[PDB]
Design a protein around this ligand. Structure first.
Ligand SMILES: N#CC1(c2ccc(O)c(NS(=O)(=O)c3cc(Br)ccc3O)c2)CCC1
Length: 304
């Protein structure tokens, strides 16, 4: 048993490296961000271009959807985040406060809050309605590589190149747990598991790990790919078989069996580092995006 992801569409149009791709929660759309300072919206099932969203004055590292699929937030080298109305393309709010590049962002499940992480080593929590910063967390001592809310929104997980993963209480801003590795490889990505009990963490020693953050115990390790430089997204695939999905610096998409940790598929098609992957919420569809020598997004579909 293995998935059989096959290339269905190639999505071209960005003029520089693509930095992130995300499927909307309602399954209809894909959003992409790029070093060309643009956001593009595409049909999730047919890859059809829908619109370009513009406004940032430097490149964009990350984009994220609100839970009702109506808003996007983007994180830019221009030190701001921007909240967007997707249907109109209008910038609703510009979130100012970080003192250097903003690298990562996410809405909470109710989507009344935004979390961000920056080169300035802080994590900020923002009010969507007013656009104002509610909390500044002194989260790390190196740039923040990822931020993510758990399934109910009571917790935030952050990661950094200082080598730490930290769990934060959303309401109070307190640090509830710090995950430490004696070899201390830079942590380049983290996110909560679908059931909220685990975190998946990428380190720049070509390794992904599944952690029980409450116990500080590593349950699973996934290797075989290449990741020593970039902050590459990783995913849990919940629509068919239980797979882990990640990009790689050898230009492939890697898919692992969650439980056995074996590689089950490698997706060949991109011509530069696959920096970002995303999994469709209801169908067995993967989106992948690559860096400057490629500049495209690819949609892959599987029977399981
Ligand atoms: N091995 C393994 C374990 C496992 C097995 C089965 C699971 O469902 C989960 N929960 S999870 O990690 O949140 C999850 C991952 C994927 Br991919 C899909 C759905 C989903 O609930 C976790 C951890 C030790 C047993």
């Amino acid at each position: 048993v293995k998935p059989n992801y096959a290339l269905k569409f190639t999505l071209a149009g960005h003029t520089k490296a693509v930095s992130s791709v995300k499927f909307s929660p309602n399954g209809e759309w894909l959003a992409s961000s790029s070093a060309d300072k643009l956001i593009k919206i595409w049909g999730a099932y047919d890859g059809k271009f829908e619109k370009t969203i513009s406004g940032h004055k430097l490149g964009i590292s990350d984009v994220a959807w609100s839970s009702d699929s109506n808003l996007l937030v983007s994180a830019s080298d221009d030190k701001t985040l921007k909240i967007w109305d997707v249907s109109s393309g209008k910038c609703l709010k510009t979130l100012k406060g970080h003192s250097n590049y903003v690298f990562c962002c996410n809405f909470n499940p109710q989507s009344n809050l935004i979390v961000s992480g920056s080169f300035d080593e802080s994590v900020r929590i923002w009010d969507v309605k007013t656009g104002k910063c509610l909390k500044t967390l002194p989260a790390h001592s190196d740039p923040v590589s990822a931020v993510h809310f758990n399934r109910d929104g009571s917790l935030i997980v952050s990661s950094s190149y200082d080598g730490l993963c930290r769990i934060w209480d959303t309401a109070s801003g307190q640090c509830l747990k710090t995950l430490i590795d004696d070899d201390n490889p830079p942590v380049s990505f983290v996110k909560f598991s679908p059931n909220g009990k685990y975190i998946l963490a990428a380190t720049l020693d070509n390794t992904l790990k599944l952690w029980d953050y409450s116990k500080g115990k590593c349950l699973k390790t996934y290797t075989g790919h290449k990741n020593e430089k970039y902050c590459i997204f990783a995913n849990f695939s919940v629509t068919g078989g239980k797979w882990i999905v990640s990009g790689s610096e050898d230009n492939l998409v890697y898919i692992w069996n969650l439980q056995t940790k074996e590689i089950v598929q490698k997706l060949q098609g991109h011509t530069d580092v696959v920096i970002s992957t995303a999994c469709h919420p209801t169908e067995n569809i993967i989106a992948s995006a690559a860096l400057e020598n490629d500049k495209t997004i690819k949609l892959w579909k599987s029977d399981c």
